[PDB]
Design a protein around this ligand. Structure first.
Ligand SMILES: *[C@](O)(C(=O)NCCCCCC)[C@H](C[C@@H]1CCNC1=O)NC(=O)[C@@H]1[C@@H]2[C@H](CN1C(=O)[C@@H](NC(=O)NC(C)(C)C)C(C)(C)C)C2(C)C
Ligand SMILES: *[C@](O)(C(=O)NCCCCCC)[C@H](C[C@@H]1CCNC1=O)NC(=O)[C@@H]1[C@@H]2[C@H](CN1C(=O)[C@@H](NC(=O)NC(C)(C)C)C(C)(C)C)C2(C)C
Lengths: 306, 306
């Protein structure tokens, strides 16, 4: 037993990280087959930086302007193209460590592992959620651009995030691996703010089920609630609406614990209305919302990756 | 910015995990050069299990009794020996993925990454501390024995933990990689209890410094305290004594933030005495004690591994 914020094993992604240097800018790239993916603002400088036109900026570049450093081995760029806000550098060598992979654009509320990197070298791995306001609460210092987020599904790495920038509230914004920002953000220094966030209700419920699976039983009650009456309480506390689809997804966990989803909603209602009164759940004094129903099942049943 | 429970990149350890099967028991082993390390209770059965004599049990074993499965490749055991509570299986093949490594026995309060594994396949990675009572609050299901904990220091993996068992409170006990249990535990089903735990004071202080580095400034105060007067308050709240050595270790963080260590102690004092009053620090409503001073510096300055 026990329940931890668990990341996927990072080895499959570690073997893909490279350093991309252009001009005075150095950041991380992702090397899959013979392509290196990195944020397009690597072609920017200290003054391009306020309102650049990346199409103009890129037409002015030559392949030899791109230093791609794969460990102590230099990779030669033989072509480049821009796809939305990512740059794709064609190199003459296919990454022999390329895992089976997919690029996926995730929905808010879904979680993923982030491999934080500097100068092409991994620093650490941690678990994140895509917040409802399309930011992530990451841990990113200067130089971390191009670090990626990912899930692993049996043997396949599903890349879902590449880091671009930090918002003045200390949260982070980035793109999918096809260069489309999550949320309304743009890779331009103009005023941008995250937008009001909300708590991921279906994930809180999953985590309460995790608690029950692990022996925290104390927040349960005899009551039930309707979805409607629950959602009226959730809105007051800035929680995302719970949909019948969320209820269906929580089915397996409800069946394993014997606690109907709507009964667990009645428990969440009382926790919102009464607080936790100096008690903890799974070692937290807050209601945790960065575990999906799938995360809970994976960790409570022991799914591996090969 | 941002601050997360960060694990080390796990790839160097993923390449060392194997499956060890003997009799009806299957667990994980660690393959370094031509040796596989695993818990000695792999030689146990459903009834050996209450009071085994592992020396007798092992003399009765043959090399061919040990199935070591490295992916879809079987490793032949050519020798075996017991070292305390770990079994060392000599195999005919050296692991080509063997990283630079050391075996280290850590002190309580020190943190490490755990690569949770089942059937030789990694499931997830998370960060732990060795509690003052020599347990760890892990996430371990049946089959996880032989998963290891580790730190990485530039290019060197320092293995510090191998998982053996779960205590009735849902916490975990194990050994160093030389098979010596942390704490008073034994690999025998007899009554054993963790012992009263305490909070790791020097780590809480490190995490408050992390908060200041990241812009949470609110818990600070104008006051100071003596070490003596601080430790009198810490004892009341079941905190470990803070030593002058801890104060010295916190020096760099104190110098970077401009907050004297004893001034941060005065802040911790008021947090213990007053609670947090519905506020959070670094996204937690509890005082966090599983970041060491080194963890904070590493994450707030961006140290990598190559
Ligand atoms: C990222 O570019 C990086 O790691 N680069 C390494 C090389 C030095 C700079 C190259 C451009 C970096 C990651 C940031 C740094 C701190 N935390 C992070 O996550 N991204 C950026 O530097 C992006 C980049 C340029 C600015 N920027 C920022 O993140 C800005 N933030 C904003 O300007 N935000 C608003 C636009 C919303 C106001 C800071 C101030 C944090 C540097 C672009 C946005 C093109
Ligand atoms: C570990 O052996 C394992 O993963 N093995 C896989 C093969 C099946 C059993 C082989 C022995 C397993 C990990 C445990 C399981 C649940 N959580 C874990 O961390 N360890 C054990 O099964 C150890 C092993 C035998 C019992 N045991 C336990 O952990 C016991 N706990 C205790 O008996 N604890 C006291 C001795 C303190 C009472 C449980 C009940 C959790 C199975 C030994 C201790 C030799």
């Amino acid at each position: 037993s026990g329940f931890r914020k668990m990341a996927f094993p990072s080895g499959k992604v570690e073997g893909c990280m490279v350093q991309v240097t252009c001009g005075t800018t150095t950041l991380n790239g992702l090397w899959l087959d013979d392509v290196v993916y990195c944020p397009r603002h690597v072609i920017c400088t200290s003054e391009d930086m306020l309102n650049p036109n990346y199409e103009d900026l890129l037409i002015r570049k030559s392949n030899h302007n791109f230093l791609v450093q794969a460990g102590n081995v230099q990779l030669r760029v033989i072509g480049h193209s821009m796809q939305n806000c990512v740059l794709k550098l064609k190199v003459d060598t296919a990454n022999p460590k390329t895992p089976k992979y997919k690029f996926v654009r995730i929905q808010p509320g879904q979680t993923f592992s982030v491999l934080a990197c500097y100068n092409g070298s991994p620093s650490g791995v941690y678990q994140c959620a895509m917040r409802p306001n399309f930011t992530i609460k990451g841990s990113f210092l200067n130089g971390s651009c191009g670090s990626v987020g990912f899930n692993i599904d049996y043997d396949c790495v599903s890349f879902c995030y590449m880091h671009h920038m930090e918002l003045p509230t200390g949260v982070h914004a980035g793109t999918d691996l096809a260069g489309n920002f999550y949320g309304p953000f743009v890779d331009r220094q103009t005023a941008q703010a995250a937008g009001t966030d909300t708590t991921i209700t279906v994930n809180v419920l999953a985590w309460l089920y995790a608690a029950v699976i692990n022996g925290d039983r104390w927040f349960l009650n005899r009551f039930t609630t309707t979805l409607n009456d629950f959602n009226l309480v959730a809105m007051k506390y800035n929680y995302e609406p719970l949909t019948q689809d969320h209820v269906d997804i929580l089915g397996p966990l409800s069946a394993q614990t014997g606690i109907a989803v709507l009964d667990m909603c009645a428990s969440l209602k009382e926790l919102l209305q009464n607080g936790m009164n100096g008690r903890t759940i799974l070692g937290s004094a807050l209601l945790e919302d960065e575990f999906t129903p799938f995360d809970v099942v994976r960790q409570c049943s022991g799914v591996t990756f090969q």
